[PDB]
Structures are given as C-alpha cells and as structure tokens.
C-alpha cells in the first residue's frame, strides 16, 4: 500500500494522474525503476517512482 506525495498530471502514453495524499496499489516497475505501474480509484497506469511512498 502506497500514498502519493505530489500531484502528477498524466502526459498520455499510459501514464496516470495522481493527487497528493491519494492511495495507490503498486503492481511493479520499469527496467530502470524510474516508473511505477499503479492502480488507483481512477484507473491503472504509470507514475513516477519517487512521487509515491509506502504507508502503514
């Protein structure tokens, strides 16, 4: 379980918009770990790995 640290606006290419304080489930990462594939209430798609952090 993760929480979003900052807003991120989707730039297409299967990226997902997230809002600060939103909850996220993490499915995995790309090859260099810079991108994270996540699921939120709004869908599923890629977000920056350091825009999120574990919670609990």
């Amino acid at each position: 379980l993760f929480v979003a640290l900052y807003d991120f606006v989707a730039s297409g290419d299967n990226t997902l918009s997230i809002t600060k304080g939103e909850k996220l489930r993490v499915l995995g990462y790309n090859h260099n770990g810079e991108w994270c594939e996540a699921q939120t209430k709004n869908g599923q798609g890629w977000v920056p790995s350091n825009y999120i952090t574990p919670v609990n």
Binding site: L5, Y6, F8, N14, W35, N50, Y51
Partner: peptide
Amino acid sequence: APTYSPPLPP
C-alpha cells in the same frame, strides 16, 4: 512504460 524519464520531484 514511457521511454522518457519522469519529471523530478518538486
């Protein structure tokens, strides 16, 4: 996953 790198954190 996007081939570009993501924005740096604010």
